[PDB]
């Protein structure tokens, strides 16, 4: 931190105590939030922000540099060949991927499978030239369980069939049971603390994204209140994905009129990739990608078995 203009040993202390230990967090901060820190004046705040941006080289980029930025995105395999294909390789870091669908479609299964897959080095696809082995080493997951359906048994079973050690997945997966939207949002905001404590959080799961909000703000005469809170939550998730180069996955429920993911416009805008998971015959499932910034809408057929997600 003292590498930053105006920042001395004392100011560096104030910053770390305030939660600002990374150059990127400072470069992307507002004069206000920094001035909210005791002895940090407006000029000092503005000076260190500009300095952090410079050190992080956050200016105009063009040509090959645009490809290099895109190469810092790594992807997590879903264990499904067709789904990985529709995803353009796998679940993308630096983005929010939403899986919506009717009950029993497999949303929670995909979340569990992702926590397991994170522990298989060969399931993280990346360009070694842009992403070092160290950046994805000792990856850990955060599972914000809003519906109380996290199941250690399922983790162990999926791990076993993948040839991975179940206990290792549990040891490297943080689960936070949220009973309402306030806890849900706070847990998400506190993931930064886990990072600061030395945990390489590379996967963040929110299951479910909207169930709490939908139950707390029912009156359609309070919908604005809900969309605002939902918007702040989504903003935290997106920034989280970018600053810590991790994949963020969220599940969403559906309502009639055929079906549409709930959460309104804000969720639609904030989500990067949007899927509708449908049920086929027996254990067959169809993941339909209907929105993304660079991939064509497409369908991926897969199955949910005792082994987890397969095909
Ligand atoms: N141990 C298992 N072995 C085989 N199939 C399983 C196992 N556990 C769950 N399933 C399948 O997973 C389906 C449920 O997946 P799940 O991801 O929980 O649905 P969901 O979309 O999240 N539904 P909901 O929480 O109501 O929105 C079941 O109905 C089972 O067919
Ligand atoms: Ca992003
Ligand atoms: Ca259910
Ligand atoms: Ca079933
Ligand atoms: Mg579920
Ligand atoms: Na096994």
Curated annotation (Swiss-Prot):
DNA-binding is among the record's keywords: yes
Pfam family, one: Rad51
ATP-binding is among the record's keywords: yes
InterPro entries per UniProt: AAA+_ATPase, DNA_recomb/repair_Rad51_C, DNA_recomb/repair_RadA, DNA_recomb/repair_RecA-like, DNA_repair_Rad51/TF_NusA_a-hlx, Hlx-hairpin-Hlx_DNA-bd_motif, P-loop_NTPase, RecA_ATP-bd
Key words of the record: ATP-binding, DNA damage, DNA recombination, DNA-binding, Nucleotide-binding
CDD domains linked to this entry: archRadA (cd19515)
GO molecular function: ATP binding; ATP hydrolysis activity; ATP-dependent DNA damage sensor activity; damaged DNA binding; identical protein binding
NCBIfam families: PRK04301.1, recomb_radA
Family named by the database record: Belongs to the eukaryotic RecA-like protein family.
PANTHER family: MEIOTIC RECOMBINATION PROTEIN DMC1_LIM15 HOMOLOG, RECA/RAD51/RADA DNA STRAND-PAIRING FAMILY MEMBER
Its biological purpose: Involved in DNA repair and in homologous recombination. Binds and assemble on single-stranded DNA to form a nucleoprotein filament. Hydrolyzes ATP in a ssDNA-dependent manner and promotes DNA strand exchange between homologous DNA molecules.
Protein name: DNA repair and recombination protein RadA
Gene transcribed to yield this protein: radA
